[PDB]
Design a protein around this ligand. Structure first.
Ligand SMILES: CCCCCCCCCCCCCCCCCC(=O)OC[C@H](COP(=O)([O-])OCC(O)COP(=O)([O-])OC[C@@H](COC(=O)CCCCCCCCCCCCCCCCC)OC(=O)CCCCCCCCCCCCCCCCC)OC(=O)CCCCCCCCCCCCCCCCC
Ligand SMILES: CCCCCCCCCCCCCC(=O)SCCNC(=O)CCNC(=O)[C@@H](O)C(C)(C)COP(=O)(O)O
Ligand code: SF4
Ligand code: SF4
Ligand SMILES: [Zn+2]
Lengths: 208, 52, 96, 95, 176, 126, 113, 114, 43, 52
């Protein structure tokens, strides 16, 4: 499996599994899962009441020093009752490593803002307000960042349509750019592309 | 910068949005005489940085 | 390249650099616009034997992630890796 | 082989022409309806049927890797020629 | 493996101090900048004489689309819709039926040239080299719907540019 | 305390930005999609899907393209169980109808049945 | 040797790094004694802080202490000691050695769905 | 049924926040009609504010009306600070849109929508 | 095979360092030329 | 293959616009260095992964 297959990094896998055990046993109040991917990325799935105590740990602890917040992300998964999956990506420049801190909320439960840990989060979770509708409590300036000013709805939710509900055009009667319900001259064509044969037997879920 | 966009256009067909580096490698192999012209660019470009 | 030597010397004096050795206009040193046809090589899996795809199936060696902890002694404190090695200053040109 | 409706409008190789009472001819008023006058159905009819001495013929449309995927055509029917599915060149077993 | 930009502690001997003060009072680096600008004044400029002189392109260039033909007049498109399945912009609209001799041929082959991102996935997905993205880039229109090509416009681009398109494919196809 | 008690029905229709016409006139369909009988694979019958009722698609006067005015005409949602899809429809105020999962009942397969002594289940050829 | 600059902007040179590290490490241990002994955070932080304090007590030279504390400049080692102290003072108030406050739902971390 | 709140503990604090947001909008409307130089009256804009508050009057969940108050404060902040233009303020008044058929018979006449 | 490759010995060396050639007189000489121009003008 | 190219990393000293300018100019220098190393160490072979 040399030329076309990605080489497995067992050293980093062992080190990240050990540090995942380390974080899981220092903070058992909030750590719910710890997993390491086959391409060696550590995920620490925590409880949403421990957003600040976990992230302040990894930023400040001398065996962690995750001083950089690379990215902050939500993922809409509507089949869960807590549909939004808040993803922190952290970079330790000291130990040359990356960690992922995952948590969850629904539309109505607020998540605590992590600007007290990473000021970088000030826009990112604000984008999570704009795109997903997740509210962040004790945020300095929480408002929209990317959508238009009168925009109704949160676009990256998966029940939100691809084109929106409204569209703009200039109207010379009122001398104004106006919004109207969206009509497309050509509809977006939906492609059912998924093959009915199982692609990956390792990821098979057990039946009912 | 125009000459490096010519490099992009020689290797992919577009000057900016190449779609050339893909998952799996690159889309197409380097055409002949491209690396010679990359060398001829690089031989002169330090003087451009120097006068900047 | 067609500059006369008076303007060429004035230009090299004003720049402070020998400009003619490195012209930013391109001339007959560049490659031909018509090239011979290539013969591109094949990859390593272009073989007629010992080339079963189950021995080179990269996507099907991807495993689901190993769950290290799940909520269903005097061991050493660990870090996510060894600490980063201090970078060495450049032997080429450190600006020192 | 382009033809013409009673409205004077040219009929395409599909067979598309607007009705007389269709308003959408007004888009060609003062302008032209761009049709292509090289009908491929007539141009592949101009090609002669290739007499071959084999039972199964292979067609790639010529040019090697500049034609189509190479296919194999059976020539055991004598009433019908063996038409390539890509290029329309039709073949016949000579015996 | 790293270097320190701008970590030069200057000399404080009277030679270097007087050099820096003469640079301050006599504007040495400003005359260096004037000298570099004066050096480009006497260079031959890089300006080509468009429209009479043209910018250099390669045979891979991705410009205006064209539906091609086999060297018998038969069109290459066998209505397989790979170019519209692969199309990242959904610019290609295809409808097909068997024509009067039973050939799998399109009746609708639309490309919206204002959706198109000109990336050439259609010509590399095409199994029979029917759709290509040719070398024409000077096709600006005065109206939006003139950039909404049907099958007639694309087959006319093929008939218009085939003498060039076939030679570009001939120059490039061993890289494909 | 730090936890409140909300015994109301979960409804977020005022927060999703969806207009009224696309809440109270749409019929979501919660269903396991049938296997394509062109194929024998069953990986597309594994999850529940929520789609909506089709609205009018008309002809574009310029090109003949399918013009629509339904924003929800391409919205297909994936759910692991029936009850998750029902909860997501009820949360968004979508009136829904549910079709039960139609698994194939198990068959009785015998290769020797093709060659029986007295039964009609012999194959006339093989 | 009086290192002229640390190289990092906003991080000034510490004149007495050894006594500063000793004071910060003993203050870390004094704060960390208020955590219960069964907590893994106290065990691990006492272990690494005792290692660092023994390395600081074992080396008079500044640069050799930088190479064997394995944390870069000595001033960012001091900065990390201040961050660890602030962290431990927060960990006393948070009490995160307690059991898990709430189980996630049954398919909360199931991917793919 | 034990959930974590946003700001309000029950519906009374929630209605208090709704009421203060309504006060802020009601005070702001003449300033908005002046500095955006809108062609509506002050009474017409205040009727639109009353309409936008009565549209959400059916909600009994404290978290949902807390988010409605938060989004109303965001819209007010985009209004007071001139971040909206005249167009974003006048998008509340669907003025270029033709009036929709309401009864059965006109909806039958125009098309297939229920 | 026929492929775009570097030549048999590779390419030549490529300059990549700063080359600011340090032209001009000393500061002593520049003030000398300036003061001499002043003295000629004054005379 | 960035572990197989040799280049330097320009580090500023004051955190200002001027050191970031000098870092970007020196990164153009080091890009010329890496391009020379890429032209000299270019291997033959295929350009896509041979997993079809
Ligand atoms: C100073 C005043 C101007 C003196 C003439 C001058 O300097 O000519 C440029 C002449 C050529 O300079 P170059 O850029 O090195 O020539 C390269 C060209 O490619 C070589 O030239 P070329 O190969 O391109 O030849 C074609 C060119 C030939 O060039 C000329 O005819 C030059 C212009 C002559 C006026 O002729 C033209 O392009 C026709 C241009 C017609 C209009 C020119 C401007 C007229 C202004 C007055 C009215 O300069 C010199 O030879 C050095 C300066 C000499 C000064 C002598 C004392 C005065
Ligand atoms: C010019 C254009 C300006 C546009 C301004 C748009 C601002 C939109 C703000 C909307 C914020 C809301 O809708 S919060 C309202 C939600 N409240 C509820 O669901 C609770 C029910 N509320 C009520 O019944 C309200 O009448 C009261 C006043 C809170 C109590 O009345 P009840 O007693 O009888
Ligand atoms: S242009 Fe090519 S890819 Fe597209 S439908 Fe025709 S034959 Fe298929
Ligand atoms: S070039 Fe790309 S966007 Fe344009 S028609 Fe082809 S596939 Fe579509
Ligand atoms: Zn053929």
């Amino acid at each position: 499996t040399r030329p076309t297959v990605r080489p497995r990094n067992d050293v980093a896998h062992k080190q990240l599994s050990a540090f995942g055990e380390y974080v899981a046993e220092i903070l058992p109040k909030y750590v719910q899962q710890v997993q390491v991917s086959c391409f060696s990325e550590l995920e620490i799935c925590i409880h949403p009441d421990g957003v600040i105590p976990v992230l302040t740990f990894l930023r400040d602890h001398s065996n962690a020093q995750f001083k950089s917040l690379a990215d902050l992300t939500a993922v809409d998964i509507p089949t869960r009752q807590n549909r939004f999956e808040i993803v922190y990506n952290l970079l330790s420049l000291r130990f040359n490593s990356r960690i992922r801190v995952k948590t969850y909320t629904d539309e109505l439960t607020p998540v605590e803002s992590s600007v007290s840990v990473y000021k970088a989060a000030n826009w990112y979770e604000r984008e999570i307000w704009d795109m997903f509708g997740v509210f962040f409590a004790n945020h300095p300036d929480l408002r929209r960042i990317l959508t238009d000013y009168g925009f109704e709805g949160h676009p990256f939710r998966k029940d939100f349509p691809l084109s929106g509900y409204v569209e703009l055009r200039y109207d010379d009667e009122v001398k104004r750019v106006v919004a109207e319900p969206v009509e497309l001259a050509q509809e977006f064509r939906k492609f059912d592309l998924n093959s009915p044969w199982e692609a990956f037997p390792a990821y098979r879920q057990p039946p009912e | 910068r125009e000459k490096m966009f010519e490099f992009y256009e020689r290797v992919s067909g577009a000057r900016m949005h190449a779609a050339y580096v893909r998952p799996g490698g690159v889309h197409q192999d380097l055409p002949l005489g491209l690396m010679d012209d990359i060398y001829e660019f690089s031989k002169n470009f330090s003087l451009r940085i120097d006068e900047l | 390249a067609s500059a006369t030597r008076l303007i060429q010397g004035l230009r090299n004096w004003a720049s402070g650099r020998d400009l003619q050795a490195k012209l930013q206009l391109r001339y007959q040193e560049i490659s031909k616009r018509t090239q011979p046809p290539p013969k591109l090589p094949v990859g390593p899996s272009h073989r007629l034997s010992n080339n079963y795809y189950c021995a080179r199936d990269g996507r099907r060696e991807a495993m689901p992630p190993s769950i290290v902890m799940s909520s269903q002694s005097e061991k050493k404190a660990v870090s996510p890796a060894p600490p980063i090695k201090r970078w060495e200053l450049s032997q080429d040109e450190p600006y020192l | 082989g382009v033809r013409t409706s009673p409205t004077g409008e040219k009929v395409t190789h599909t067979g598309q022409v607007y009705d007389d009472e269709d308003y959408r001819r007004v888009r060609f008023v003062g302008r032209q309806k761009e049709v292509n006058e090289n009908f491929a159905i007539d141009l592949i009819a101009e090609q002669p049927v290739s007499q071959v001495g084999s039972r199964v013929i292979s067609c790639d449309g010529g040019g090697g890797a500049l034609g189509h995927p190479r296919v194999y055509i059976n020539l055991d029917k004598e009433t019908k020629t063996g038409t390539c599915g890509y290029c329309g060149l039709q073949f016949r077993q000579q015996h | 493996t790293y270097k320190y930009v701008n970590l030069r502690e200057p000399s404080m001997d009277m030679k270097s101090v007087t050099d820096r003060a003469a640079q301050t009072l006599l504007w040495t680096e400003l005359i260096r900048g004037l000298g570099m600008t004066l050096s480009y004044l006497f260079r031959e400029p890089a300006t080509i004489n468009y429209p009479f002189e043209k910018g250099p392109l390669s045979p891979r260039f991705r410009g205006e689309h064209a539906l091609r033909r086999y060297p018998s007049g038969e069109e290459r498109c066998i209505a397989c819709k790979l170019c519209e399945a692969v199309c990242p912009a959904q610019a290609i609209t295809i409808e097909a039926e068997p024509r009067a001799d039973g050939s799998r041929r399109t009746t609708r082959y639309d490309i919206d040239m204002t959706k198109c991102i000109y990336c050439g996935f259609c010509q590399e997905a095409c199994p029979v080299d029917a759709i290509v993205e040719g070398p024409n880039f000077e096709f600006s229109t005065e109206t939006h719907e003139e950039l909404l090509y049907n099958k007639e416009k694309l087959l006319n681009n093929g008939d218009k540019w085939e003498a060039e398109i076939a030679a570009n494919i001939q120059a490039d196809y061993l890289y494909r | 305390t730090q936890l409140i008690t909300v015994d109301e029905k979960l409804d977020i229709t005022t927060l999703t930005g969806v207009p009224e016409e696309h809440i109270k006139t749409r019929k979501a369909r919660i269903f396991v999609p049938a296997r394509n009988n062109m194929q024998s694979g069953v990986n597309n019958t594994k999850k529940w899907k929520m789609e909506f009722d089709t609205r009018e698609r008309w002809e574009n006067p310029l090109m003949g393209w399918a013009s629509t005015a339904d924003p929800l005409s391409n919205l297909v949602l994936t759910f692991s169980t029936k009850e998750d899809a029902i909860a997501f429809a009820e949360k968004n105020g979508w009136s829904y109808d549910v079709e039960e999962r139609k698994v194939p009942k198990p068959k009785s397969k015998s290769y020797g049945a093709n060659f029986s002594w007295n039964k009609r289940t012999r194959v006339s050829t093989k | 040797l009086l290192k002229k600059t640390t190289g990092l902007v906003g991080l000034a040179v510490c004149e007495t790094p050894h006594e500063r590290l000793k004071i910060l490490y003993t203050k870390i241990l004094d704060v960390l004694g208020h955590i219960p002994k069964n907590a893994a955070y106290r065990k691990y932080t006492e272990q690494i802080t005792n290692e660092k304090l023994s390395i600081v007590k074992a080396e008079p030279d500044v640069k050799k202490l930088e190479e064997q504390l394995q944390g870069g400049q000595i001033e960012e080692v001091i900065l990390q000691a201040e961050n660890e102290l602030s962290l431990a003072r927060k960990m006393i108030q948070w009490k995160p050695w307690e059991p898990l406050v709430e189980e996630p739902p049954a398919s909360q971390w199931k991917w793919p769905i | 049924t034990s959930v974590k709140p946003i700001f309000s503990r029950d519906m009374n604090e929630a209605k208090r926040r709704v009421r203060e947001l309504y006060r802020a909008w009601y005070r702001e409307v003449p300033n908005t009609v002046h500095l955006f130089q809108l062609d509506i009256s002050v009474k017409q804009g205040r009727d639109k504010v009353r309409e936008m508050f009565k549209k959400n009057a059916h909600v009994t969940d404290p978290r949902v009306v807390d988010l409605l108050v938060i989004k109303g404060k965001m819209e007010l902040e985009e209004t007071i600070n001139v971040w909206k233009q005249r167009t974003h303020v006048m998008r509340f008044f669907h003025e270029t849109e033709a009036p929709r058929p309401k009864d059965f018979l006109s909806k039958f006449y125009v098309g297939h929508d229920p | 095979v026929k492929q775009d490759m570097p030549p048999v010995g590779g390419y030549g060396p490529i300059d990549y360092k700063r080359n600011l050639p340090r032209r001009g007189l000393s500061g002593y000489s520049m003030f000398a030329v300036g003061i001499g121009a002043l003295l000629f003008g004054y005379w | 293959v960035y572990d197989q190219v040799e280049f330097d990393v320009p580090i500023g000293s004051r955190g200002d616009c001027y050191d970031r300018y000098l870092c970007r100019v020196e990164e153009m220098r080091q890009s010329i260095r890496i391009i020379s190393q890429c032209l000299n160490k270019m291997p033959p072979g295929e350009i896509k992964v041979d997993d079809a």
